[PDB]
Amino acid sequence: DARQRLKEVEVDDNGQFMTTDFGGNIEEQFSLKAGGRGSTLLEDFIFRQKLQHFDHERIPERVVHARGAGAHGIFTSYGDWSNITAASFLGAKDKQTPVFVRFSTVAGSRGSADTARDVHGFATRFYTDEGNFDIVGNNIPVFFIQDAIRFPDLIHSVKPSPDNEVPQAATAHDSAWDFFSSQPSALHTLFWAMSGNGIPRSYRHMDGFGIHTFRLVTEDGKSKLVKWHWKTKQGKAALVWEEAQVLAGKNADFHRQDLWDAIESGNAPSWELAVQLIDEDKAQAYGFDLLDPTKFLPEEFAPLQVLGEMTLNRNPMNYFAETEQISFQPGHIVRGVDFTEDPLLQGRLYSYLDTQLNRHRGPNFEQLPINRPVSGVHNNHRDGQGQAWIHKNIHHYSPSYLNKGYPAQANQTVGRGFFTTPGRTASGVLNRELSATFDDHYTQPRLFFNSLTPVEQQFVINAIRFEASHVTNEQVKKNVLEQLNKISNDVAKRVAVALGLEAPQPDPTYYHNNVTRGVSIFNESLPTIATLRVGVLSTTKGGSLDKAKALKEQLEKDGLKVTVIAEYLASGVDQTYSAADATAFDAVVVAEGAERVFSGKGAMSPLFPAGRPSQILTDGYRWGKPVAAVGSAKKALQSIGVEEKEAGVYAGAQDEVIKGVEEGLKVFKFLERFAVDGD
Amino acid sequence: DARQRLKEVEVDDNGQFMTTDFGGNIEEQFSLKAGGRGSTLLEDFIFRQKLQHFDHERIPERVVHARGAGAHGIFTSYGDWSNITAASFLGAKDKQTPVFVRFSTVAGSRGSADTARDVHGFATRFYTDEGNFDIVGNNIPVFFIQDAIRFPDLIHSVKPSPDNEVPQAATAHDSAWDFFSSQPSALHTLFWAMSGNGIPRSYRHMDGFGIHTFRLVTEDGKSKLVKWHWKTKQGKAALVWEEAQVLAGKNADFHRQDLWDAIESGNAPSWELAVQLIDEDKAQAYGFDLLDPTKFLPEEFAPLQVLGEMTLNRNPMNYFAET
Amino acid sequence: DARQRLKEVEVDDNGQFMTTDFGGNIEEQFSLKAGGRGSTLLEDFIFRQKLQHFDHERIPERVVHARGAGAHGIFTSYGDWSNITAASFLGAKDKQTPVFVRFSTVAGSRGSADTARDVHGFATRFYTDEGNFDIVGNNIPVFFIQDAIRFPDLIHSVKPSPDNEVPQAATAHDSAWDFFSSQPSALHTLFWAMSGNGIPRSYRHMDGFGIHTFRLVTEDGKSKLVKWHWKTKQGKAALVWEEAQVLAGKNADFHRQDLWDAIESGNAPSWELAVQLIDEDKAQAYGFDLLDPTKFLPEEFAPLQVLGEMTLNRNPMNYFAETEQISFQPGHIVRGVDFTEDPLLQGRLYSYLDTQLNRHRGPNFEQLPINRPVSGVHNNHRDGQGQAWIHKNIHHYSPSYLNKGYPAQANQTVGRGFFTTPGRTASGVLNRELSATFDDHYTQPRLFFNSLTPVEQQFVINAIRFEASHVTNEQVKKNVLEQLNKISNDVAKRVAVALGLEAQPDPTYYHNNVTRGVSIFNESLPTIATLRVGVLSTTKGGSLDKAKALKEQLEKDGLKVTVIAEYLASGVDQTYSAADATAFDAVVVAEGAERVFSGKGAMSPLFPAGRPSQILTDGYRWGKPVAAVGSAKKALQSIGVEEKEAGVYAGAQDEVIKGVEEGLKVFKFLERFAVDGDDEE
């Protein structure tokens, strides 16, 4: 149980009498009044203690990544990695460390939809026996900007316009694309966010990245440069944009509910922790500067080396107390890890400590149960708002004869203390500059686009076409085109058509044809289909529901979550047509006999919106899902112009449809149904 | 200009050099570093004052009605209403008073969709020459509960489940319908929320209500019981649910944008402020108790009297500072 | 151990390496620098997490009573008092309840002197098994004002002038006496604050009062009006003003050190809890309205009935986490107690809950270890800043099918819930007035003055004389005279002399009635344990050996003895440079030490000129028992004190010890203070 240490703060109210927050049993369903129909009395202490706590329930949302959700789990080290790091949680084979992970979007506020297009947070806390260690990462290996002093500019430009606070959770407006084109460093992360990484199927189907180069340091101070990677054991999977848009309205909680259900049903998601390791003398060996967070290291130059596996298997008990209150910091570092002179990382260390003072309005937020380390806290800090401990040592200072030297200093040689890498040097003038080594903003965007499949590439261009079409200012649109033309002339040409703008002339300076592995989503089928969702469209008339139940029980044997849909909640029905939408499922199959709700009288009913069964099948087909029909239900496929000939379309008897749908879920998205420019 | 008094706090940055918050011109696109590829210095005061302000930008959202938008306008009285109220802003024909109005949903958080099904808030401030007078109303004339001590119970039950914070901005989950069925007073507002009032076409196409019976008092202390009504001059209009759902994803800002567009286009929306007036000795004469906020007074028993008109004709300049 | 429940939050750093607040061993004595003499690096996470916690150490002081100190203890009931109250902590003989008590002044900020002249706070929390019950009282039984809405006006007027923030911790300025004269209800508390109650010898030598009439209610709902009293088992004792003033400079921590020392030495102070009980139908039957907080109920009309005893026997471990952070509320009420329509108490209920939001900057302050009840919290409250728990019940609302009805409602008959007194009614028009029964502002101030001894009365007149002479505005001073004249023409006449104003009788409220239990100096102390004796000695000759034997015998009687000399020779507790008469309750010159009172021994680089003579002079002039052993008689002579004066003891060691211990019971010798008319020719 990853949540074991949280047991002692849990409050059980079963069988208990209602109390105030200072004890004493009460009733609190009636205000105290002066006469039968009289005014409420100030002396009603019960009312005011209850309402005061309600009145003050909210705390400020995170300044970025406000929308998110998380879970507890366990990290297991695969080996004794003392040859590369002194870090205790990586110090022995099969060593286990509790974790908590919070996934998120970036731009939207607390209540915005999970399926907005956005970068995604992927933040992990290791509660190691030598302190909390956070990898505060994203699902994309590069960031928009090269210096942390520019983060407010990026965020302001992406978040809603400050006059009317429009639009919510979206980069599709003038200020964002004005920034993207005025600060060309942003073009790499933008391309990733315009790819499938911007609309992932779930948190469980994301890879994760620390982005920055850090340092791993051994006991003797020798260091290696390192990139952190999380490799999902579920495989990477993405939606298509037209599907994410509807899903945002039909279920804004799609991702947080997906993670909750996977854990609750015993299908805990897993990620392997992997590293790229680079010697210090190769920091600038690979065509870019590893201090530059707008570049990633191609795995051709440094393969991913697996160090262990993380499994998330415990949901929180109270979302606010745990998920909302947890306070991540890249400065949560432990012995055996160090920073690098990455100018974006450098400013993060300041920003995350400082921002907790706003979100928690006090300096004692690390005493909150979800923030507490398991290893013990011994220092001379005292007081502060909400001080929750009582310190014995009255000589709260160092050095001191009266406390006998305790708490005592720890460094590299004694007490397993943290230490900065011994060899790191400073040299040169104090400057407000960036190294000329950072100046290439176009090569790696071109490399990323090169390494996607043709329809994957078309998804990127259609995202850009959609987004830039919302930009009202003509010059900004031409600025965007001028910058895309430096990445690829064909990309600029294809986007220019949607904007009604001329195809610009080639600017070949940064063009190249190289490819790299591990960045594509749609070029690989899923390693498992467990937890994927099948909507079975049925009907309460005839014998369709009995067949739908048999279909359901077989699909569940493969670990799928199957929803039987009909006009009303008859026996065996999981959802009504009125509440159903194709966005909820990874495959749609029509049960035999249910073709009666796709035309005529069965399609016109007061119990669901007109055309709803046909709309679900149409949606599922057009969004690239496996779609199927059993027996006579093939007529439902005919009614929407779909043929069994097609990839990802299955008809025939039950066992044939089951095998086909299950194969199709491995493919997940059938890109044959998406037109490519000049195909 | 309804916003006339706010111009002295307006700050124009066109044509100026970047400064810190304590003055002095600066550049702030590069951190100070110790060497060409070096670490950032703690003595970069420019960096820290810039990032500290960004780090501290957010304030807690409203505990309810967190999702909303507003605008400025003018209220004009149609008459000298001194025979029923001493209220200064109603004391003369054609008297004008600045207003600000915020419209909202109730359950959803700051970034939830405008076209969620919900009660809608309709909060009006009159900046009168005798103090601020707020009518903090909804687009539905009745409320769920009969005693304010039960508000945390109602709100907890409708807002997302506290274990996983699901579902956003929605009554369609177990705890809400548990409460509606366990606290039967809730059924009136429920029915209103399940009608077109729950999914309006826009803020301009809603009516508004103070809900509670209040009192109008004259100079010499004579009182009448009063119900406040806002009657939209744009007409009431609503969507259908299957459309509001898609709209929640296609444009979460639909109502926000619609209000902004109408004002900027010169199509300012208006409402008439109207009252039902009841003698004190009739507080219990109409088949219910006028102190009970789960009931409305049918207009057959007391028709509306029109006091004046409000027009919303100026959008805010900074959403945060104003709305 | 009354602190037992707090042991789970205590942190032991002995034998440990230094860490950050998120774990990980560290060193934090050098900033991380870019080169040997380089600038400090922003990536020094150790520096910033260290200094951030330092930079955010302070919280707002209390808006009033900012200055004070407290301790843990035990309350023991003397009986089963369910015949008068359903309160659990009073439900069985020898039933014990943990307490915390904080004493305080009122006007001064956090770092002002203990021995300022002021009303004093006396706040007790009972951690009962049916919730926290607080009695938030003062060492004076009456308050300045009759309606809580006037509290900011009173407090603004006695706190420093808002232009220069002058004066600190004092009523002796224009605005305060402008308010006392403009709002005559304040005159009663003013007289108490001008008496010994304003300058008590220690927290342990104060009585305590709930002030308000409350209600005790039995299980069946029958009620009685009640006044709470704390009666100190150490006796009431007070300083004189000219001594309190010097003490404010020589030791601003005099009272909090007193309490800490008494508890550490095993002399835990005690108070008895006593009540006055009044029938509901007699609320207005004793010459005033018992809803009026400017009145007290004379003990001749209703005697004190002891319910139990409280003993304070454990100091805090961390002052900030316990004493500074504790949040008292008169709304901290339990089953068996109820409020009254006293308009001052009424507004207090709102104000103490509200002010916690400012001091603790969040609504979860009852989760702080010092504020937590011992009885258990079960409700549907959630979230809030700094939420320290993780609630299991996901159906956080009532009523509810899904949560099976839990947590469940408790009332009078089910679950031992709180209930308002059943017979209480409201009748009449909603009003912004006060009952005309509150109108008399002068009778009880006169009753209080009438009940003090002649020198005690002179202390009151001399305090007013001192204070009003600071008022620059002439009309304010005359306004003060006119109001004083309504209490007593003689009092007004004697104050007028100091102010140079003219002395006519206004007899509407004059009377000669007296009542018991309001004087301090008319009764000697029941014990001299913990009282302090300064033994003045010297390092030359045999004086020190004699002073040690003197100290030994005095300590056998429970006295705290300080032997003083030129330097810290063996057996010396304090140097003359560091000593002052304010620190002691009696001053004894050891034999041989007369050499430091004149000639060569009195002029030394090791202490200020004349310091031993000044300590003895201060001690005598301030009414203390003073003594000299053997030849040290000459020291008394050098300051003009005669051996046979009251409270002056000369002779051999044995008679001096006996005389000093007897004089400590008297405590202050009031024949040394002139009374108006004494100097007449």
Ligand code: HEM
């Ligand atoms: C490689 C670049 C970055 C990555 C991978 C990243 C990732 C993240 C993630 C995952 C979170 C959400 C943590 C959670 O779930 O609670 C977050 C929040 C935050 N980020 Fe970043 N971020 C980056 C850049 C920056 C920069 C440059 C700044 C400012 C200099 C910044 C300031 C913040 C702040 C203030 C928060 C809110 C933290 C809180 O309120 O607890 N981020 N970031």
Ligand code: HEM
């Ligand atoms: C007739 C019944 C009610 C109506 C018409 C109503 C209306 C509103 C409206 C329109 C707002 C948002 C105003 C804005 O745009 O900022 C609001 C917010 C709020 N309401 Fe109500 N409400 C009702 C019942 C209650 C009750 C019973 C309580 C608690 C006792 C309550 C507590 C609050 C609070 C605390 C806020 C947050 C206000 C702020 O943060 O500024 N409401 N209400």
Ligand code: HEM
């Ligand atoms: C009989 C009248 C009163 C008595 C006996 C009394 C007593 C006390 C005491 C002893 C304290 C300090 C408790 C501690 O040591 O922490 C205190 C604080 C305080 N008092 Fe009163 N007081 C009275 C009148 C009032 C009134 C009328 C108000 C306002 C309506 C008021 C407002 C406050 C506030 C706001 C605090 C600060 C509490 C905190 O910060 O925790 N008091 N009072």
Ligand SMILES: [O]
């Ligand atoms: O971030």
